[PDB]
């Protein structure tokens, strides 16, 4: 029973890393997630046992809808269709729900109607360097390392609706594939405080007892 | 110190309307704001732990916005249990400074 501690069986799992809502008629409603691994505290602690990682990426989106309270008179809507646009590092970015950056050609989008299998998509290892870097002892602002940049995701409705407001949620699932890890690192003791840096507050080494014997 | 100023300190609105409470800082605090809600019996809880990110267990009637110095809190559907006092607290520099209260009541 020695193979469940390999790097493939330790890191290649699924994890809910983001959860956001958006509606159709608010003219402010669309979602946005910059792809990182530093948001949740249980995936960050596992990926920070190593200094340099190199993995492919696989994302799955779970999209549900809910009917908001409309006025009256027999709300009857067809099936809904969503657009999940992926912006590579160094691409145009939408600011409104109706924009020219949704219709561009180098931003690969998926289109998905409700009632089917969820829309999986996969992203290869995109970097100029040869590995990602969990830790960076240097300046770009201290410890940013602009070289590991995976991009941004954007979600919206493509159906125009007038008779009934509809809001929708989305849960993004994160799964590394073909993982390679270098230069191990001790596990983090203090609690995480911020996202970008390694700031902390000092804590005791271990839980204490009443005597040495 | 950064003086968090809420210049209204009293709002009056009926049931079911949209209310907007504004909190203005002294300098740029860079999207580090929190909104708390103090019930009239004395219990305090956290509503929005960023400029616009909702805490888990909070109804979706609350929303926030703003950038730089000016910020806002929006309740589009006022309910009976939403009659409380609201504070803004920055988390940028030392020490932590809270804003003044803002009490809500019904119009007529």
């Amino acid at each position: 029973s020695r193979s469940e501690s390999s790097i493939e069986n330790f890191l290649c799992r699924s994890a809910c890393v983001y959860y956001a809502t958006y509606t159709n008629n608010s003219k402010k409603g669309f979602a946005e997630w910059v792809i990182n691994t530093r948001q949740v505290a249980q995936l960050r602690r596992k990926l920070e046992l190593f200094t340099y990682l190199r993995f492919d990426l696989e994302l799955t989106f779970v999209i549900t809808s809910a009917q908001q309270p409309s006025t009256a008179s027999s709300v009857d809507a067809p099936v809904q269709t969503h657009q999940i646009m992926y912006v590579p590092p160094g691409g145009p970015v939408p600011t409104k729900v109706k924009d020219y950056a949704w219709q561009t050609s180098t931003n690969p989008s998926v289109f998905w109607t409700e009632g089917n299998a969820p829309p999986r998509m996969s992203i290869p290892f995109i970097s100029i360097g040869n590995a990602y870097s969990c830790f960076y002892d240097g300046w770009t602002v201290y410890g940013i390392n602009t070289l590991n940049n995976m991009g941004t995701l954007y979600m919206r409705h493509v159906n125009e609706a007038g008779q009934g407001p509809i809001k929708s949620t989305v849960r993004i699932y994160f799964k590394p594939k073909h993982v390679k890890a270098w230069v191990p690192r001790p596990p983090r003791l203090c609690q995480y405080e911020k996202q970008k840096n390694v700031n902390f507050s000092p804590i005791g080494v271990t839980t204490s007892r009443t005597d040495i014997i | 110190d950064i003086q968090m100023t809420q210049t209204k300190s009293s709002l009056s609105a009926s049931l079911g309307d949209r209310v907007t409470i504004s909190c203005r800082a002294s300098q740029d605090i860079s999207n580090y704001l929190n909104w708390y809600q103090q019930k009239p019996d004395g219990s305090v809880k956290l509503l929005i732990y960023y400029t616009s990110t909702l805490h888990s267990g909070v109804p979706s009637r609350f929303s926030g916005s703003g950038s730089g110095t000016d910020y806002s809190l929006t309740i589009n559907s006022l309910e009976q249990e939403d009659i409380a006092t609201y504070f803004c607290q920055q988390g940028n520099t030392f020490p932590f400074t809270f804003g003044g209260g803002t009490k809500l009541e019904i119009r007529r």
Partner: protein, 233 residues
């Protein structure tokens, strides 16, 4: 014994080498070897009783050391390995214990939870920055959190033995020797905006002596760059 490099000579009498690999070579880069391969001896730090630790950021300590500090300004990129000799000279009447780790990419934390520490607080030019045995308060804006039991990086200080390290026990040992290769994600990087190594010396068991003995023990660090090459015309 009596190893010489260029126009410098030190004397020694085991060696722990990196992650099991030796520092080796790779537009077209040039390779200087008469310019860099010599023993740069930093000044000595004094190990007293109430001491806490020291750290050196490694391509920052040799930034004003003669001709290695000139090639950092002239050439843009560069890669290098190191060979570190740490040795403290005490009698058989002193007692103590040191840990000599070499941490790759040791990103440190500020005392205020919202800021990042400034440049003069991470590394002094060829001078040792030192840990403390207390906390730094949050009222200080840009200062490194130097609680020695957390090693400045928010991690347990007993778990620092996963890095290439060596124990110096004054009962039985006197010196340490570390040979570090080039560890980075890119093959060549800028030497001013990245400090890819950090040499820490932390006393686990403190110094003790009786009355009459010398109240200090000096520690001497000697660094020699091995297999360095820069990218330029």
């Amino acid at each position: 014994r009596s190893i010489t490099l260029g126009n410098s000579t030190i004397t020694t009498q085991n060696v722990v080498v990196g992650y099991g690999v030796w520092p080796e070579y790779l537009d077209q880069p040039t390779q200087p070897d008469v310019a860099t391969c010599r023993f740069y001896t930093l000044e000595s730090v004094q190990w007293m009783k109430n001491s806490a630790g020291w750290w050196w950021k490694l391509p920052d300590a040799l930034s004003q050391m003669g001709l290695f500090g000139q090639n950092m300004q002239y050439h843009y990129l560069g890669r290098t390995g190191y060979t570190i000799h740490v040795q403290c000279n005490a009698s058989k009447f002193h007692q103590g214990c040191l840990l000599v780790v070499c941490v790759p990419e040791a990103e440190m934390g500020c005392s205020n939870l919202n800021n990042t520490p400034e440049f003069s607080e991470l590394s002094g030019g060829d001078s040792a920055r030192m840990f403390t045995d207390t906390q730094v308060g949050e009222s200080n804006a840009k200062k490194v959190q130097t609680a020695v039991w957390n090693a400045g990086m928010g991690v347990g200080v007993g778990n620092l033995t996963i890095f290439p390290h060596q124990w110096i026990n004054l009962r039985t040992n006197n010196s340490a020797t570390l040979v570090m290769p080039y560890i980075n994600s890119v093959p060549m990087d800028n030497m001013f905006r990245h400090n890819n190594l950090t040499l820490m010396i932390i006393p686990f068991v403190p110094l003790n002596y009786s009355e009459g003995s010398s109240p200090y023990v000096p520690i001497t660090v000697t660094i020699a760059p091995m297999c360095a090459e820069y990218n330029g015309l």
